Design a binder for this molecule. Structure first.
Ligand SMILES: *[C@@H]1O[C@H](CO)[C@@H](O[C@@H]2O[C@H](CO)[C@@H](O[C@@H]3O[C@H](CO)[C@@H](O)[C@H](O[C@H]4O[C@H](CO)[C@@H](O)[C@H](O)[C@@H]4O)[C@@H]3O)[C@H](O)[C@H]2NC(C)=O)[C@H](O)[C@H]1NC(C)=O
Ligand SMILES: *[C@@H]1O[C@H](CO)[C@@H](O[C@@H]2O[C@H](CO)[C@@H](O[C@@H]3O[C@H](CO)[C@@H](O)[C@H](O[C@H]4O[C@H](CO)[C@@H](O)[C@H](O)[C@@H]4O)[C@@H]3O)[C@H](O)[C@H]2NC(C)=O)[C@H](O)[C@H]1NC(C)=O
Ligand SMILES: *[C@@H]1O[C@H](CO)[C@@H](O[C@@H]2O[C@H](CO)[C@@H](O[C@@H]3O[C@H](CO)[C@@H](O)[C@H](O)[C@@H]3O)[C@H](O)[C@H]2NC(C)=O)[C@H](O)[C@H]1NC(C)=O
Ligand SMILES: *[C@@H]1O[C@H](CO)[C@@H](O[C@@H]2O[C@H](CO)[C@@H](O[C@@H]3O[C@H](CO)[C@@H](O)[C@H](O)[C@@H]3O)[C@H](O)[C@H]2NC(C)=O)[C@H](O)[C@H]1NC(C)=O
Ligand SMILES: *[C@@H]1O[C@H](CO)[C@@H](O[C@@H]2O[C@H](CO)[C@@H](O)[C@H](O)[C@H]2NC(C)=O)[C@H](O)[C@H]1NC(C)=O
Ligand SMILES: *[C@@H]1O[C@H](CO)[C@@H](O[C@@H]2O[C@H](CO)[C@@H](O)[C@H](O)[C@H]2NC(C)=O)[C@H](O)[C@H]1NC(C)=O
Ligand SMILES: *[C@@H]1O[C@H](CO)[C@@H](O[C@@H]2O[C@H](CO)[C@@H](O)[C@H](O)[C@H]2NC(C)=O)[C@H](O)[C@H]1NC(C)=O
Ligand SMILES: *[C@@H]1O[C@H](CO)[C@@H](O[C@@H]2O[C@H](CO)[C@@H](O)[C@H](O)[C@H]2NC(C)=O)[C@H](O)[C@H]1NC(C)=O
Ligand SMILES: CSC[C@H](NC(=O)N[C@@H](CCC(=O)O)C(=O)O)C(=O)O
Ligand SMILES: CSC[C@H](NC(=O)N[C@@H](CCC(=O)O)C(=O)O)C(=O)O
Ligand SMILES: *[C@@H]1O[C@H](CO)[C@@H](O)[C@H](O)[C@H]1NC(C)=O
Ligand SMILES: *[C@@H]1O[C@H](CO)[C@@H](O)[C@H](O)[C@H]1NC(C)=O
Ligand SMILES: *[C@@H]1O[C@H](CO)[C@@H](O)[C@H](O)[C@H]1NC(C)=O
Ligand SMILES: *[C@@H]1O[C@H](CO)[C@@H](O)[C@H](O)[C@H]1NC(C)=O
Ligand SMILES: *[C@@H]1O[C@H](CO)[C@@H](O)[C@H](O)[C@H]1NC(C)=O
Ligand SMILES: *[C@@H]1O[C@H](CO)[C@@H](O)[C@H](O)[C@H]1NC(C)=O
Ligand SMILES: [Ca+2]
Ligand SMILES: [Ca+2]
Ligand SMILES: [Cl-]
Ligand SMILES: [Cl-]
Ligand SMILES: [Zn+2]
Ligand SMILES: [Zn+2]
Ligand SMILES: [Zn+2]
Ligand SMILES: [Zn+2]
Lengths: 691, 691
């Protein structure tokens, strides 16, 4: 038979390994020839594997690259302007790759050019609260200073935005061993830790869902009208550059001024972690000087889009997508995900060659330019938004399959919780000590839910990956799953470094490719059930439970300000009412879905399930973030990787005790409560009987 | 049998007459008790007629009313401040109504309060080009002047906006006999002409699709957060008041300064039509003084919403809607439309009682507060936008059934052209001289298309009626039809006056109610086919033909500026390409629709037809008009009643030779060409094979 078991059994660890090796021998940086060649290869293979159609969708988007003949670096400069110390021009290449060409040196993509010189201020992780501590509590002024911040905790674009608004004139990002060197493990090539010469690449945009900086709202096709650079979305206004911890030690060791305010500000280097302005007495006249010469350049990118046409509902799309561009070799990020997608396509294609077709259409995507701001997925979604809006069932992401080897990690919409619980109960655990036990059992034991006993942790979707446009802009039910470590937002130690190689994975992460195989079963299994189940496998009652938890949480935040809630008559009654109504209606809808031979009622009902995530979309978007339209979830305004619930109310309450016009600030809290209550009620009403 | 013929034959002229009489004995001003009572009556009758459910949907919206104890009026004031002439405090009531209470006196709804005094400037119709002529050609400065404008040609809100931007400190609107007194017909009560004491009420907002001024985007429900008045949408900043032509004669007869620039500026009164500033020498020291004391007040309004559940596709909605609130008695506007809807409901209910149900769900609506800015329909659509977005097949409007007795008038989306042509070929003409001929034949003879031989005129939808939110905001295929005169935007002579009575209609417009019956057949017939046809009766190829005509037209406008198109490289190639592609794809889709027992393919195909109008929606809206989202059609920025095609490009080109930075202005033209070409291509792609 052709059922999910047939699909799952066809998946092979050995194939995932072969594909990973194949995808990671040379760099595949977005906009380069090597990445176009890999695009064409995947297009050819997906055709051979059996898909109905496989096309490249290309766009011309703003990318950013260092100047090959004018390298980026940072100096300590003495009183006469002699550069007495320079940071590295490249990461030492790993064994056997020392002759690979076209390894892009470390740089912060989209940094403007400049050569700012000044005194350093150390800002810990450069979080919103780190800057509050400096400015409000320690009275340190960052204006006209070069800030040095350690990577970790939040997306680097948020760090740069926060430094910019503090008045910094440049930002230096570095990897501290406290966050990127696990105790008792060796540096790469002998273990999975970051060496002191290693450096994390990454873009520093603040696009808030816009896609290509030059074409917000519309695909960057051949006739697109582009904004000028000065009106581009999301570009930083000060130079930025990342360095390793050998170099950081040299910049930090001389730091003077104030001591760190407490131990949460001290990393693991043998330096005091003084916050500064500037260096200690002997060196008080030395300054730090950046030299940044990278250029932004409109460059063609290529998505591969494969279609397996549905036998019964070809106008319903279940999408499995992940990116293909990498900073260097992409051994984990993204190729451990891409190899998984490739083997899923192969397995579905095997069934198809035996005469099977899924009920609904499955679309497979190899996105480009994810590393430069989710550009490939976003431009494609902009181009196809009307098809996706009216036909998109679900989107499953497929970036890195592993970031550890401890247990499963799933982040998804509540609509998919039951599907995930059920699927994982049917899959074998790959974990040592759980042989013959289900994945559900090992996962629940290692990652217990903080709310529910005997349930595994499933997180909200944040952002920093290609599901953003589908979920937060378009309101298509989305999910992601990977193997993870025992933290969360900093990246594994060799994240976005030249050391992320095939050997890293094969030697230290997943020698048997059993965790990759388990991830292929979870992602592929989800796609299979979404594309094949007669009734869409969404449970609206799970959304009701979570909405109540989020309503309690946002209410609790507001209740830190009881006097203001009295003065301004701030009531959450409408929101709790809406959540109660959603709970009641969802219960009744579930009864009809269980209690209803009628394909019209069925599909009516499948349409109600598909459009439920869609109902949380507000076409006016969130304040000053028009591409974040989901009212229940948005990327945190302080950390793009993290999800925030009731973001419009959350942001209206954030730091409210500091606003100069409390009447106006509390009015806006009330406005956002109205918007949230209305949207919850409206979503509930889509589940009522239709007439 | 239960087919369209059964439905149509059940409709009776005599019933329409009885209902019109019933709806027009007392005023039904929005927000008043009398209008709530009529709401409850219609709700009860629709229940008795057989609908499945009939509910009131209420909202609390900003309305505007004169102060009963402090009347509005205008004076000529002499040098000492003596008021030597005052305009009327009320219209003389018609025969037999001189003891009716609660007739609202003439006023401009939403005018602010004020008592401005100044010299008059006469501005013809106060159109954009009238102000261009005054300011640019005649060098007359309106700053700090009271402007006097004749009604006609464009929506009065546009007049007031144009006066405000010219710097006027007040606006006086009046009805000129040239526009409101047809040669050779008597004044009311002895004919259908406007008497000199008659005055046209009407709101002067510029809401651009927003609905309730205080709650743009969201329904004005019980917990809604409201903007403060100073941030309300669309309110005028200068006092405004309308008067009749006896009063206007007294204000205009003394006018001095410049002569009218040409005869298109002269009405029919025995005055010179001098443009002024101020009065002739003897009276140079007399001024004009307004006294406006109306107040804006949040007030409850009530929509009646009736449902006839579909037997096969209950989650597809075909909506017949028109408003119920009137300025006074509403003899034509809206009750000639409401009586028609009432008889349609009765007829569908008769079939339903015999066991019939339409294929799709039909929703019937009696909207409130249309006269105050389309408030009832818009708030309801805001509340239900997710249901309408995903389930709305079509909206047929049903305001005034007659504005003349000459021939049919239809304005609709191209998707409904074929449906209208076909239906009218099956209906009998009511016209004298066409007995035994079809409505199509009489209509085509009396109102020939300017493009096509042997085809009738069908206009684009503009605005100024309740279809605006459904069509221009939500992208639901919409249409309207009424009997009309042999002009177009000024209103019939007794429009919005106390003289619009049952007797007006029964005596002078439609004594036999045969034109009302013909309109009931066209509106009801359309609803019947939309709700019952197995394949939705839309023809996408008709959109292709019109898109080419609009592309030619906008290209021709740009080509008035050949040097600028060369300098700035302004190409329409992408738009013509998109239109060509749409034509090609629509042709193929039509072949499949003809060539396809399979309910999934059918409904797939019906979904492609239903979502085609939806595809022209841009979620970012038009520049500074976020609620006008349709890229092909928007209300003219110079006249809300009129539709404009390719409005984003049209507005970018308008008066472009006057812009100070031509580079920037032409850049914006190019941007709007990109947006239009992309949206046309995207819409075309929704008609491609789905996978
Ligand atoms: C959750 O679902 C429930 C339905 O089960 C829904 O209940 C509705 O609540 C509204 C708002 O409270 C009710 O609105 C009332 O409607 C009556 C007429 O039906 C009006 O007379 C009421 O107005 C009077 O009272 C107000 C409050 O004191 C005054 O402000 C006002 O001036 C009037 O004097 C009021 O508008 C509505 O009737 C019910 N509908 C029902 C029971 O079917 C509730 O709103 C849902 N929650 C959300 C967040 O949508
Ligand atoms: C109407 O439908 C047609 C399809 O029938 C569609 O045609 C497409 O036009 C685009 C834009 O012209 C073509 O894009 C080209 O794609 C090739 C690869 O396929 C590229 O190599 C081309 O780029 C080169 O040439 C450009 C122009 O000189 C250069 O600017 C560029 O730097 C490159 O050197 C170019 O991107 C596309 O191939 C066709 N698709 C087909 C034929 O299927 C057309 O776009 C539709 N109209 C609209 C308004 O969408
Ligand atoms: C995850 O798996 C669970 C457990 O199988 C699924 O829940 C079960 O779903 C079935 C099918 O709808 C339910 O059966 C129904 O029961 C009622 C009797 O009350 C009957 O009227 C129906 O005809 C049908 O037999 C079953 O009760 C239910 N079990 C539960 C909720 O405990 C669940 O649907 C799966 N989730 C998915 C697929 O998203
Ligand atoms: C308005 O009425 C016209 C005239 O009846 C309708 O057009 C006609 O529609 C029928 C039904 O689709 C077409 O018949 C088809 O013809 C082809 C043969 O080429 C055949 O393959 C199909 O099986 C079917 O018989 C007919 O050709 C067509 N006539 C035309 C276009 O001249 C039109 O659909 C109506 N518009 C509506 C209902 O919106
Ligand atoms: C990755 O695998 C692909 C496909 O097996 C290899 O590409 C093939 O290479 C052979 C030898 O050059 C050619 O004859 C085929 O035409 C290629 N097939 C394609 C591109 O579809 C590719 O060599 C492998 N890359 C690495 C680094 O091993
Ligand atoms: C850091 O790099 C800079 C730039 O290459 C070095 O400074 C240059 O040294 C060369 C050779 O002596 C001079 O000709 C250039 O004029 C210098 N350029 C600048 C910008 O100062 C510097 O020597 C390096 N410092 C260290 C410690 O190696
Ligand atoms: C319009 O018609 C309605 C319905 O026929 C009339 O309302 C009815 O009036 C009688 C006498 O008062 C009552 O017994 C019924 O309860 C009413 N029915 C309703 C409201 O559904 C109404 O009188 C008529 N109005 C005019 C001006 O003739
Ligand atoms: C126009 O109306 C105004 C306002 O009612 C009249 O002026 C008033 O006249 C009364 C009675 O003489 C005075 O007590 C008030 O002080 C006046 N009010 C104002 C505002 O001037 C005026 O007489 C009327 N003019 C004409 C020509 O009838
Ligand atoms: C810290 S894990 C983040 C990783 N995501 C990414 O690296 N995304 C890229 C690009 C994200 C973006 O531009 O939104 C990045 O964070 O620099 C993942 O989701 O696996
Ligand atoms: C000149 S005919 C206009 C008539 N429409 C209306 O009167 N609409 C009302 C309200 C329109 C609006 O506020 O958009 C008006 O124009 O004042 C109609 O469409 O029959
Ligand atoms: C790279 O640097 C060298 C030195 O300025 C220069 O010749 C070239 O313009 C630069 N390339 C760019 C800016 O793309
Ligand atoms: C920080 O220093 C700058 C640089 O002179 C100054 O302009 C700014 O006002 C300072 N801000 C505070 C809070 O002291
Ligand atoms: C794999 O698992 C082992 C055993 O717990 C752990 O010690 C090792 O470091 C893991 N590898 C990685 C990269 O986490
Ligand atoms: C109406 O006018 C009289 C006189 O100002 C006044 O008593 C009352 O306040 C007014 N009503 C309003 C402003 O609603
Ligand atoms: C119109 O008159 C006003 C009033 O003094 C003046 O301020 C304004 O600049 C004038 N505009 C023109 C075009 O003359
Ligand atoms: C009705 O039709 C007649 C005949 O053409 C016309 O003269 C009369 O004025 C019409 N009534 C109205 C209100 O147009
Ligand atoms: Ca874009
Ligand atoms: Ca509103
Ligand atoms: Cl992922
Ligand atoms: Cl109408
Ligand atoms: Zn990645
Ligand atoms: Zn990455
Ligand atoms: Zn009307
Ligand atoms: Zn009206």
């Amino acid at each position: 038979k052709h059922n999910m078991k047939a699909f799952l059994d066809e998946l092979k660890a050995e194939n995932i390994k072969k594909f990973l090796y194949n995808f990671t021998q040379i760099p595949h940086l977005a906009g380069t020839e090597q990445n176009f060649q890999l695009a064409k290869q995947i297009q050819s293979q997906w055709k051979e594997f059996g898909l109905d159609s496989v096309e490249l969708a290309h766009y011309d988007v703003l990318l950013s690259y260092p100047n090959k003949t004018h390298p980026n670096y940072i100096s300590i400069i003495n009183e006469d302007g002699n550069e007495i110390f320079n940071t590295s021009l490249f990461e030492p290449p790993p064994p056997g790759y020392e002759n690979v060409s076209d390894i892009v040196p470390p740089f912060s993509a989209f940094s403007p050019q400049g050569m700012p010189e000044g005194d350093l201020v150390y800002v810990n992780y450069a979080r919103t609260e780190d800057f509050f501590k400096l400015e409000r509590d320690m009275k340190i002024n960052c204006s006209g200073k070069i800030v040095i911040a350690r990577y970790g905790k939040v997306f680097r674009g948020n760090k740069v935005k926060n430094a910019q608004l503090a008045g910094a004139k440049g930002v230096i990002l570095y990897s501290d061993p406290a966050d990127y060197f696990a105790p008792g493990v060796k540096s790469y090539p002998d273990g999975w830790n970051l060496p002191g010469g290693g450096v994390q690449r990454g873009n520093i945009l603040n696009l808030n869902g816009a896609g290509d900086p030059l074409t917000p709202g519309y695909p960057a096709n051949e006739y697109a009208y582009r904004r000028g650079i000065a009106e581009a979305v999301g570009l930083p206004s000060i130079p930025v550059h990342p360095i390793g911890y050998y170099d950081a030690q040299k910049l930090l060791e001389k730091m003077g001024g104030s001591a760190p305010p407490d131990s949460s500000w001290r990393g693991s280097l043998k330096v005091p972690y003084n916050v500064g302005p500037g260096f200690t007495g002997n060196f008080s006249t030395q300054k730090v000087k950046m030299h940044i010469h990278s250029t932004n350049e409109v460059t063609r990118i290529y998505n591969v889009i494969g279609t397996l046409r549905g036998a019964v509902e070809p106008d319903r799309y279940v999408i499995l997508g992940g990116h293909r561009d990498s900073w260097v070799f992409g051994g984990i990020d993204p190729q451990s995900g891409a190899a998984v997608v490739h083997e899923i396509v192969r397995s579905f294609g095997t069934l198809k060659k035996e005469g099977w077709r899924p009920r609904r259409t499955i679309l497979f995507a190899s996105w480009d330019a994810e590393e430069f701001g989710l550009l490939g997925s976003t431009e494609w979604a902009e181009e196809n938004s009307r098809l996706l809006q009216e036909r998109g069932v679900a989107y499953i992401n497929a970036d890195s399959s592993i970031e550890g080897n401890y247990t499963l990690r799933v982040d998804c919409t509540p609509l998919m919780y039951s599907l995930v619980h059920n699927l994982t109960k049917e899959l074998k655990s790959p974990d040592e000590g759980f042989e013959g036990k289900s994945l559900y059992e090992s996962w629940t034991k290692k990652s217990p839910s903080p709310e529910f006993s005997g349930m595994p942790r499933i997180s909200k979707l944040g952002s920093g990956n290609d599901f953003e446009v589908f979920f937060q802009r378009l309101g298509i039910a989305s999910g992601r799953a990977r193997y993870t470590k025992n933290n969360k937002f900093s990246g594994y130690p060799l994240y976005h470094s030249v050391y992320e190689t095939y050997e890293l994975v094969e030697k230290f992460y997943d020698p048997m490719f059993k965790y990759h195989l388990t991830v292929a079963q979870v992602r592929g299994g989800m796609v299979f059930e979404l594309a094949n189940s007669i009734v869409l496998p969404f449970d609206c009652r799970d959304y009701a439970v979570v909405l109540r938890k989020y309503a309690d949480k946002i209410y609790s935040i507001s209740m830190k300000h009881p006097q203001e809630m009295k003065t301004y008559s701030v009531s959450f009654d409408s929101l709790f009412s809406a959540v109660k109504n959603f709970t009641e209606i969802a219960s009744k809808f579930s009864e009809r879905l269980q209690d209803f031979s009628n394909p019209i009622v069925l599909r009516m009902m499948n349409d109600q399930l598909m459009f439920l995530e869609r109902a949380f979309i507000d076409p006016l978007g969130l304040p000053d973030r028009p591409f974040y339209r989901h009212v229940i979830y948005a990327p945190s305004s302080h950390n793009k990787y993290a999800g925030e619930s009731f973001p419009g109310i959350y942001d209206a309450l954030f730091d409210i005790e500091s606003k100069v016009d409390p009447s106006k600030a509390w009015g806006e809290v009330k406005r956002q409560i109205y918007v949230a209550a209305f949207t919850v009620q409206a979503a509930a009403e889509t589940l009522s009987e239709v007439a």
